Swiss-Prot record, chain B:
Localization per record: Mitochondrion inner membrane
Name of the molecule in the record: NADH dehydrogenase [ubiquinone] 1 beta subcomplex subunit 1
Recorded family membership: Belongs to the complex I NDUFB1 subunit family.
Keyword Cell division among record annotations: no
Keyword Transport carried by entry: yes
TM region(s), chain numbering: 4-20
Membrane topology: Single-pass membrane protein
Gene Ontology biological process terms, A to Z: aerobic respiration; proton motive force-driven mitochondrial ATP synthesis
From Swiss-Prot, chain C:
Keyword field: Electron transport, Membrane, Mitochondrion, Mitochondrion inner membrane, Respiratory chain, Transit peptide, Transmembrane, Transmembrane helix, Transport
Chain segments annotated as transmembrane: 12-31
Membrane topology of the entry: Single-pass membrane protein
Disulfide bond sites: none
Full-protein residues shown: 29 to 75 of 76
Subunit (UniProt): Complex I is composed of 45 different subunits.
One CC-aspect GO term: mitochondrial inner membrane
This protein's name: NADH dehydrogenase [ubiquinone] 1 subunit C1, mitochondrial
Entry function: Accessory subunit of the mitochondrial membrane respiratory chain NADH dehydrogenase (Complex I), that is believed not to be involved in catalysis. Complex I functions in the transfer of electrons from NADH to the respiratory chain. The immediate electron acceptor for the enzyme is believed to be ubiquinone.
Lineage of the species this protein comes from: Eukaryota, Metazoa, Chordata, Craniata, Vertebrata
Protein family according to the UniProt entry: Belongs to the complex I NDUFC1 subunit family.
Organism: Mus musculus
Predominant place of localization: mitochondrion
GO biological process: aerobic respiration; proton motive force-driven mitochondrial ATP synthesis
Encoding gene per record: Ndufc1
Intracellular or extracellular location(s): Mitochondrion inner membrane
Keyword Lipid biosynthesis: no
Curated annotation (Swiss-Prot), chain E:
TM helices/strands, residue ranges: 34-54
Subunit structure: Core subunit of respiratory chain NADH dehydrogenase (Complex I) which is composed of 45 different subunits.
Subcellular location: Mitochondrion inner membrane
Organism: Mus musculus
The protein's name: NADH-ubiquinone oxidoreductase chain 5
Family the entry assigns: Belongs to the complex I subunit 5 family.
Annotated function: Core subunit of the mitochondrial membrane respiratory chain NADH dehydrogenase (Complex I) which catalyzes electron transfer from NADH through the respiratory chain, using ubiquinone as an electron acceptor. Essential for the catalytic activity and assembly of complex I.
From Swiss-Prot, chain G:
Record-linked InterPro entries: NDUC2
GO biological process, any: positive regulation of ATP biosynthetic process
Main localization (coarse): mitochondrion
Chain ranges passing through the membrane: 57-76
Protein's UniProt name: NADH dehydrogenase [ubiquinone] 1 subunit C2
Keyword Membrane: yes
Alphabetized PANTHER family for the sequence: NADH DEHYDROGENASE [UBIQUINONE] 1 SUBUNIT C2-RELATED, NADH-UBIQUINONE OXIDOREDUCTASE SUBUNIT B14.5B
One GO cellular component, as annotated: mitochondrial inner membrane
Subunit-level organization: Complex I is composed of 45 different subunits. Interacts with TMEM242.
Membrane topology: Single-pass membrane protein
Superkingdom, taxonomy of origin: Eukaryota
Assigned protein family: Belongs to the complex I NDUFC2 subunit family.
């Protein structure tokens, strides 16, 4: 694995970086046709387009990559999020906390690809933009105040270490038009979502996310019309100058340490498991032991990658 | 010795055990026959009293 | 298989040969030392 | 509230496996875990053990001493010696502190 | 005599004696001046321990 | 004695290497035979103790126990196959191994020539026991119970460590054989009066004395059945075995330095016996029964008359077997009832006919019915205690009357009276439960036929 | 302690004088223990790294059982010497300074009169 | 049918706080930030 | 010399009492700390000079060379502190409590 | 760190103790101590968090004044004996200074306040070096001068440390500080036998190093500075739960494990020398140390604390492995007791 040995002997990120190599996130409301833009921009500069973080994004990330059972993936339902807001069990907060962990894994995987291959990164919504969902959830009855504090504490502990998005794109369509966009896409859980809740999501971006990041990175606001025109947006990205931002000080000997972090997923989310016992987050020892003693028995997961024979690994007796 | 290699674990311990306990004797063999109460003189064609 | 392949799937064949080969050098030096030792002990003392 | 499992009930292992012997749920392991426990438990420990323990000979010499007494009592009485003299370590051997 | 008197005397008391002793020894401001002075006191006492047992 | 031990160690490899489904039978079947090899030590056709080798010895006092220590591992593993059958297949193999190490360690401790070998192995037995009690303990309070079991033994243990290193410097070897055939006569100073207390106190603590016995009621309450069997049958008796071999030295002081303990124990015997009379938790009552019947033992290992000692050896082996039997049947009621309360579960004989016969015989062993080694034991300690002072019969006479009352009350309010209306229906008795009992009592019947084997060093 | 002894080898592991002592039998229980101590290290490693406990790193298992043991013979070889020096040193002094360690006569019990405390 | 009591949240709570056996004043003490970095600034 | 050697030694103890009794600014301490190194340097040089022990004069200077860097490290910590608090008072160094 | 700087520093942090040990001219022993002081300070502030600057500024002042006191002892000796090194004749006060000073750098007894605080603000890694490769240097200086130091003071610093360490540890819940406190305690035993049998100090140290180095690489495997954090070990990595249990009970003196030997032979040597007063009190409060060790045992192993849902996410990802050293130093430490005679 990458180490100071490799750094000492060549393997420097600096010499692998090029103009097209940046961390570009595109953030929008629940429905901004964001997906297309990203894949489009991705297609433009060959940028590895990372999909929006999912409940089982981590399982697709690890081992076989087949989707995990819900309880193995933290028992989070976006579906139940919508049909049962302010639920007794709090699936909505557990959904949000797992989502933050998933993008933490996605952002870290993205940074690892960026510093190793040197190909730039498009990851849709980012950890920085995740807060808008929680702000809106606390604005209504979805989450209580402490729940907010617990997310903020995890965010303050883990997000600063990772370097900021080079530029952020904002595909904005008004509160009413996204709900009609919602109305025609087929899922019924997305439908019937609060107009005021959608109001709080985009308002939270405009009030906090874009100004905040307006110095940390090159924010590119785009209206819907500019959108659906990947060519134009792509053009503008190729147009902005990547100057302002903390990325300027990343010398090779500084990148090495950041790389070795993202290279270690177990650390990336080390502070995501901090022992703060808010009730929704708590596994519980008896349920948690069963869930672990069950997730660990899945084929290829009992032992470390390369050593479990079930999936067809061989040479274990000499590894 | 197949699928029966876990049945011959304990038994084997016994044998090894007996192998040591009869080896401890070999070490503690001074006063072999030099004890007072039991100091008989060697009977013909007998190497040592107690082995 | 795995989306992210293991780094250990096919053996590090160097790690075998310096692990196996090292141990066989240990013994051949160790067993040598003993018999050699026994002799030195015998000759240095009466026998 | 935090997440935890709902109380697990204890199964009536006697509902299935109506021949349950108390060792394991699946029937063959149970049968073979009593056919080997009554056997190694009772049949060759309480029986072979008691046989061997019963035949330990003259344990702690108490079978030897009821004869040695008999020949000592035979010898002491016929030769007129006291059956249990009153000092054991002979007085002659002792070198009592002379002054005191 | 069981429960309270034989549990308050031997098992519990020893529990309390220590608990209280840790509370005083570990309640420290964290300020360096205080701590350091204590180094001063120590030097003084050790200077004496040698002096009087010269 | 490495067949009683090496084959034992190999049990550990078998519990681990063996199949998850077959792990239980390989271990239980093999240690039954391990007990059969243990029986060979009983072949003493002469007085000379059997010094197997430098570190390992077995004399009349240790031999009756080594066999019991080997015997209970089979039983312990048979009484814990139910609870611990809900585990993950690696928690079991840990519990089975923990039980295996206890007798490996206990077999060696009872079969050890060097007194500090006793100490290292003596205080090691706490590690396996604390894990059995704390890790698998059902109640919220086992963390507490574990603390009590570790500190009371540990605070007693470090004084013994200092004392034994002290005698090694004073005499020059801690070898029980030599220490016996050498002149170590304490000189009744104020200091020696402390040495004596240092050596005896650690042993007096795990042998619950009236003053320090609170650890045992708390420990057996939340301990799993296998841990409670080990604590009552072998663990507490470690303290008695120690007092017999350590008082060979410190010969003069115990003549006058024992009064404090003797009186603590005999009055303690009465009060511990009495509180059994109104205690709602059955496991609680058996534990205090264990304190009182062990308070008799510390009052015979201190009077130090030949009869006391073998009264002690008789009672320790006998009460060990009886107590487990009581703790084992208490568990069978606890698992179907799901509560330790004595008042619930009334009338069981009506629904569990045989377990009640086992309950009756266990209680008759608990009280002193006469054709039992249990009575011979008490009859002898009683005699010597009377010799120490004729008045002792009064206190050892209030205990006999109380012991009869609580022993029968356990039978009268648990196994007689009208049946409880409808507790969770009580499933019939497994054959394992009944054997685990039969395995305890059939040896109690056989030993009572020839008491000579468990009579101690004195006789 | 034993340092400062005449002839001390200032940084050597086992001076050749230790040749005179018998070599440790390779199967000495201790070296065999070190072996088991080692196998366990190996097995433990596999466990902490989440590999099949016994069926993995069969090369490593060997490195371990064979590294620990190798170490043993050469360590025990020394510790054995150190202890042997201790006697050379100890016994010698007992003689060179004989008066301080005088042979004592122990009166046969017949003569000695240890007091008898009766148990009664 | 048995659940050896595994510790609940409350049993866990005590072990939090910058001092186990809190004193009247030392009670005010607050656990140090998990990141090992503090908020103070001005 | 015997008389003087006393003054220097008490100078070191007066400097000792100083560094072991802080008051506000740290730079005072570090400054005091240096007062000792001067007293040690003076005493080492003095005895070496009246023992005519020239083989040892290297030491009086090695003492200063190591002491200078020691102080360099000390001041960089000091600058680091009045960059994080900007007031350099031993008073605010209490987060570790 | 520019890898070059990393090398220079690390070399100094390593040349620092080594010069101390190798040289006999005390002066050269002092600069060995001085380097160690200079090399450790850069690493201590690597995160450069506000807590860190506090740590280093304390460590440095405590280390610096002690270094100056050690130099004063050498300077004074130079005038009481022309030699640059302590001798039989050395004035008693000259040696006592060296004991106090060196007991400050090692942080024993009434000077035990800096260590717990610097152990709290430095990373787990630099915590190990600050606890174990920085104790070798000063101890070397003491072990060399043992014939001449005072039996009374050492014992007082020894006993005090044992008590302070134990009592301090009972209340602490931060792991870094629990270890800092343990080190104070073990350091105490070590300095108790120095006047009598230095060779045992070197055993009570190695065993402490072979015990603490695995224990800390355990704390950082999951980088848990909280007991609550180490308690969820069962979910993050289950195997280390078994050995973490034995190593911590080994750190305290419980008899089957390797940890008993240092306490046992130190007690045997002190009783051989007749300190059956001192040895007894030390062993007794030594038992207090195990109480806080077992309280941690409870939280981490014997009882399973509740975990957060995101812990399932960290399980998914492959856990970066613990170096081999953990194993080799966990076993050689948890169970070597059967081989004690050759160790001593
Ligand atoms: C199982 C694997 C076996 C592999 C066998 C390989 C073939 C082989 O070795 O056979 C020939 C070989 C021939 O031996 P031998 O020299 O002819 O035997 C005659 C000796 O006189 C007989 O030996 P000895 O008694 O002369 O040996 C001297 C010394 C030898 O010392 C030792 O080797 C100690 C070994 C302890 C195990 O004796 C002692 O054991 C003293 C220490 C006793 C225990 C002290 C510590 C007690 C408390 C701690 C207990 C352990 C706690 C571990 C930590 C906690 C773990 C959870 O057999 C052996 O040497 C091995 C014997 C068994 C060793 C221990 C295995 C476990
Ligand atoms: C003669 C017989 C002497 C018997 C001595 C028994 C000693 C152990 C009894 C029980 C002690 C105990 O339970 O410690 C608890 C105490 C507080 O800690 P915690 O457990 O959190 O609080 C519970 C309070 N009951 O934890 C503590 O503060 C330390 C408790 C003592 C630990 C051993 C101290 C030995 C000191 C020797 C000097
Ligand atoms: C040694 C074993 C005993 C240790 C405790 C001795 C007494 C320490 C003490 O009394 O300090 C109190 C202080 C807290 O003070 P406060 O909170 O007011 O407590 C009063 C409660 N009613 O607590 C503290 O300030 C911290 C502990 C103070 C003592 C530190 C160590 C003192 C060592 C004394 C001997 C030193 C010998 C040096 C030889 C060189
Ligand atoms: C107790 C000593 C057990 C020795 C067993 C030797 C055979 C073996 O390889 O078992 C290793 C034991 C079980 O391993 P395994 O069979 O894979 O099943 C459990 C997986 N954790 O897993 C072990 O590593 C047991 C030994 C742990 C280390 C302490 C040994 C004392
Ligand atoms: C609690 C349960 C009961 C524990 C009893 C502990 C008793 C004290 C520890 C062991 C005492 C002991 O070993 O007794 C003998 C010793 C002196 O014995 P001796 O060899 O005669 O020394 C005088 C030489 N002319 O006398 C001593 O060791 C005196 C010990 C002084 C310290 C007492 C214990 C303090 C504990 C804190
Ligand atoms: C002198 C005797 C000293 C005491 C010996 C007996 C106690 C040994 C120490 C036990 C300390 C820990 C107690 C609590 C352990 C909890 C273990 C647990 O919770 O289970 C999970 C753990 C790791 O799990 P994993 O192997 O990855 O797979 C299963 C995943 N659920 O599962 C495991 O960890 C499995 C491996 C556990 C270690 C096996 C040890 C077996 C027992 C060793 C006995 C040694 C006896 C030596 C006798 C010497 C006599 C001279
Ligand atoms: N933190 C969050 N909390 C709740 N829902 C979220 C969060 N992050 C993303 N989502 C979900 O993502 C959905 C939007 O994704 P969508 O735009 O459909 O993906 P695509 O980019 O493929 O079109 C929303 O319905 C929203 O519920």
């Amino acid at each position: 694995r990458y180490g100071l040995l490799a750094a000492i002997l060549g393997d420097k990120t600096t010499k692998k970086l090029h103009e097209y190599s940046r961390v570009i996130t595109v953030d929008g409301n629940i429905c901004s046709g964001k997906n297309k833009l990203a894949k489009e921009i991705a297609q433009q500069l060959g940028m590895k387009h990372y999909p929006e973080a999912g409940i089982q994004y981590s399982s697709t990330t690890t081992g076989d990559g087949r989707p995990l059972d819900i309880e193995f993936s933290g028992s989070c339902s976006l579906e139940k999020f919508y049909d049962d807001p302010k639920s007794n069990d709090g699936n909505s907060y557990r959904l949000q906390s797992w989502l933050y962990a998933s993008r933490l894994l996605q952002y870290a995987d993205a940074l690892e690809h960026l510093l190793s291959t040197g190909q730039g990164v498009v990851l849709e919504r980012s950890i920085y933009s995740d807060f808008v969902f929680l702000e809106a959830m606390y604005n209504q009855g979805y989450i209580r105040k402490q729940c907010v504090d617990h997310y903020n504490e995890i965010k303050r502990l883990t997000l600063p270490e990772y370097l900021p998005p080079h530029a952020v794109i904002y595909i904005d369509v008004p509160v009413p038009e996204v709900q009609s966009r919602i109305q025609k896409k087929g899922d019924p859980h997305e439908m019937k979502v609060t107009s005021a809740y959608l109001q709080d999501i985009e308002n939270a971006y405009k009030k906090t996310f874009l100004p905040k990041m307006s110095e940390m990175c090159e924010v590119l606001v785009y209206d819907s019309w500019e959108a659906e025109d990947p060519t134009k947006v792509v053009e503008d990205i190729e147009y902005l100058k990547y100057n302002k931002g903390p990325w300027l000080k990343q010398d090779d000997w500084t990148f090495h340490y950041l790389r070795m972090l993202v290279q270690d997923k177990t650390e990336v989310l080390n502070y995501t498991t901090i022992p703060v016992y808010l009730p929704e987050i708590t596994i519980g020892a008896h349920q948690g032991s069963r869930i672990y003693n069950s997730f660990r028995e899945l084929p290829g997961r009992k032992y470390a990658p390369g050593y479990n024979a079930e999936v067809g690994d061989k040479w274990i007796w000499l590894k | 010795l197949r699928e029966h290699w876990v049945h011959i674990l304990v038994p084997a311990g016994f044998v090894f055990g007996c192998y040591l306990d009869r080896k401890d004797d070999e070490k503690l063999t001074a006063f072999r026959n030099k004890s007072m109460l039991f100091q008989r003189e060697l009977r013909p064609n007998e190497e040592v009293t107690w082995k | 298989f795995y989306v992210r392949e293991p780094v250990n799937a096919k053996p590090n064949w160097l790690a075998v040969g310096l692990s196996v080969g090292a141990s066989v050098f240990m013994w051949i030096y160790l067993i040598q030392t003993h018999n050699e030792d026994v002799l030195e002990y015998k000759r240095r003392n009466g026998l | 509230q935090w997440q935890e499992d709902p109380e697990p009930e204890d199964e009536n292992v006697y509902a299935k496996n109506p021949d349950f012997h108390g060792y394991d749920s699946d029937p063959v392991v149970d049968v073979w875990n009593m056919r080997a426990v009554f056997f190694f438990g009772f049949s060759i420990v309480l029986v072979f053990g008691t046989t061997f323990v019963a035949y330990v000979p003259d344990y702690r010499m108490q079978e030897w001493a009821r004869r040695e007494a008999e020949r000592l009592v035979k010898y002491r009485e016929v030769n007129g010696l006291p059956i249990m003299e009153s000092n054991y370590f002979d007085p002659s051997k002792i070198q009592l502190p002379e002054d005191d | 005599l069981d429960l309270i008197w034989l549990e308050k005397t031997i098992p519990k008391s020893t529990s309390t004696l220590h608990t209280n002793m840790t509370t005083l020894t570990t309640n420290q401001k964290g300020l360096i001046k205080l701590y350091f002075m204590s180094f001063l006191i120590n030097i003084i006492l050790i200077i004496i321990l040698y002096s009087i047992n010269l | 004695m490495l067949k009683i031990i090496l084959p034992s160690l190999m049990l550990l490899p078998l519990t681990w290497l063996s199949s998850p489904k077959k792990t239980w039978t390989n271990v239980t079947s093999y240690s039954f035979l391990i007990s059969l090899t243990s029986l060979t030590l009983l072949w003493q056709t002469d007085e000379n103790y059997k010094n197997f080798s430098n570190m390992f010895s077995s004399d009349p006092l240790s031999t009756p126990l080594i066999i019991l220590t080997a015997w209970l591992l089979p039983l312990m593993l048979m009484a814990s196959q139910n609870h611990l059958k809900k585990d993950n297949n690696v928690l079991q193999k840990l519990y089975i191994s923990m039980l295996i190490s206890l007798q490996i360690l206990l077999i060696m401790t009872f079969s050890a020539t060097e007194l500090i070998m006793f100490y290292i192995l003596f205080e090691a037995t706490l590690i396996p026991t604390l894990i059995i009690i704390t890790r698998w303990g059902n109640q919220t309070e086992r963390l507490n119970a574990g603390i009590y079991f570790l500190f009371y033994t540990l605070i007693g243990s470090i004084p013994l460590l200092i004392a034994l290193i002290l005698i090694q410097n004073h005499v020059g070897t801690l070898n029980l054989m030599i220490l016996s055939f050498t002149t170590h006569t304490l000189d009744a100073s104020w200091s020696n009066n402390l040495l004596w207390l240092a050596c005896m106190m650690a042993f007096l603590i795990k042998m619950p004395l009236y003053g320090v016995h609170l650890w045992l009621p708390k420990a057996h309450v939340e301990a799993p059945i296998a841990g409670s069997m080990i604590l009552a049958a072998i663990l507490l008796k470690l303290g008695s075995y120690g007092m017999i071999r350590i008082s060979i030295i410190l010969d003069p002081l115990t003549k006058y330095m024992a009064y404090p303990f003797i009186l603590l124990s005999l009055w303690g015997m009465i009060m511990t016996s009495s509180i059994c009379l109104r205690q709602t938790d059955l496991k609680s009552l058996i534990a205090y029964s264990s304190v009182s019947h062990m308070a008799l033992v510390i009052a015979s290992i201190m009077i130090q008359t030949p009869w006391s000692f073998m009264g002690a050896t008789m009672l320790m082996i006998a009460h060990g077997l009886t107590s487990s039997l009581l703790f084992c049947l208490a568990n069978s009621n606890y698992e179907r009832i799901h509560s330790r309360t004595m008042i619930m579960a009334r009338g069981l004989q009506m629904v569990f006919p045989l377990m009640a016969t086992w309950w009756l015989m266990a209680s008759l062993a608990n009280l002193a019915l006469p054709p039992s080694i249990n009575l011979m034991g008490e009859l002898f300690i009683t005699m010597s205690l009377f010799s120490w002072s004729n008045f002792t019969i009064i206190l050892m006479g209030i205990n006999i009357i109380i012991t009869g009352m609580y022993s029968m009350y356990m039978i009268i309010t648990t196994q007689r009276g009208k049946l409880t209306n409808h507790m969770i229906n009580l499933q019939p008795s497994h054959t394992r439960e009944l054997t685990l009992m039969a395995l305890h009592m059939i040896p109690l019947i056989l030993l009572t036929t020839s008491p000579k084997l468990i009579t101690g060093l004195t006789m | 302690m034993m340092n400062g002894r005449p002839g001390h080898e200032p940084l050597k592991f086992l001076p050749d004088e230790a040749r005179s002592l018998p070599p440790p039998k390779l199967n000495d229980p201790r070296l065999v223990y070190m072996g088991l101590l080692g196998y366990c290290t190996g097995l433990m490693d596999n466990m902490l790294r989440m590999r099949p406990v016994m069926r993995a790193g069969l090369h490593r298992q060997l490195l371990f059982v064979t590294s620990f043991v190798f170490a043993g013979y050469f360590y025990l070889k020394r510790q054995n010497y150190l202890y042997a020096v201790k006697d050379h040193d100890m016994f010698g002094y007992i003689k060179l300074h004989p008066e301080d360690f005088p042979e004592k006569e122990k009166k046969t019990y017949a003569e000695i009169l240890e007091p008898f405390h009766p148990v009664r | 049918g048995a659940r050896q009591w595994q510790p609940d949240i409350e049993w866990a709570e005590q072990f939090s706080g910058a001092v186990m056996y809190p004193s009247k004043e030392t009670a005010h003490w607050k656990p140090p930030p998990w990141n090992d970095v503090d908020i103070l600034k001005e | 010399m015997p008389s003087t050697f006393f003054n220097l030694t008490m100078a070191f103890s007066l400097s000792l009492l100083g560094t072991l009794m802080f008051r506000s600014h740290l730079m005072s301490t570090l400054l005091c700390l240096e007062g000792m190194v001067l007293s040690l340097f003076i005493m080492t040089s003095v005895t070496s000079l009246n023992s005519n022990s020239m083989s040892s004069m290297p030491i009086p200077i090695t003492i200063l060379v190591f002491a200078a860097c020691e102080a360099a490290v000390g001041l960089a910590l000091l600058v680091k502190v009045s960059n994080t608090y900007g007031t350099d008072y031993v008073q605010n160094l209490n987060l570790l409590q | 760190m520019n890898p070059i700087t990393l090398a220079i520093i690390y070399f100094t942090i390593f040349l620092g103790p080594v010069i101390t040990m190798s040289s006999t001219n005390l002066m050269l022993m002092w600069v060995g101590l001085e380097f160690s002081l200079l090399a450790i300070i850069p690493m201590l502030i690597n995160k450069k968090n506000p807590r860190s600057t506090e740590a280093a500024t304390k460590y440095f002042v405590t280390q610096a004044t002690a270094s100056m006191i050690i130099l004063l002892a050498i300077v004074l000796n130079y005038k009481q004996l022309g030699t640059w090194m302590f001798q039989q004749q050395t004035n008693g006060l000259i040696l006592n200074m060296t004991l106090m000073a060196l007991s400050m750098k090692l942080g024993l007894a009434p000077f035990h306040f800096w260590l717990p605080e610097v152990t709290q603000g430095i990373p787990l890694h630099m915590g190990l070096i600050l606890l174990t490769w920085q104790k070798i240097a000063p101890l070397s200086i003491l072990i060399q001068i043992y014939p001449l130091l005072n039996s009374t003071i050492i014992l007082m610093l020894a006993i005090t440390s044992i008590f302070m360490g134990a009592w301090g540890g009972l209340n602490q819940t931060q792991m870094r500080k629990i270890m800092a406190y343990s080190s104070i305690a073990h350091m105490g035993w070590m300095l108790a036998i120095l006047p009598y049998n230095p060779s045992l100090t070197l055993l009570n140290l190695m065993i402490y190093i072979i015990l603490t180095a695995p224990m800390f690489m355990a704390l950082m495997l999951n980088n848990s500075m909280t007991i609550n954090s180490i308690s969820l070990l069962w979910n993050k990595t289950p195997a280390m739960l078994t050995m973490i249990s034995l190593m911590l009970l080994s750190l305290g003196g419980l008899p089957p494990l390797t940890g008993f030997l240092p306490k046992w032979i130190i007690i045997t040597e002190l009783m051989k020398n007749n300190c059956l007063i001192m040895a007894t009190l030390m062993a007794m409060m030594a038992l207090l140390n195990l109480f806080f060790y077992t309280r941690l045992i409870y939280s981490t192993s014997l009882t399973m604390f509740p975990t957060n849902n995101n812990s399932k996410m960290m399980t998914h990802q492959t856990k970066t492995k613990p170096n081999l050293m953990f194993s080799t130093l966990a076993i050689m430490s948890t169970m070597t007791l059967p081989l004690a005679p050759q160790l001593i």
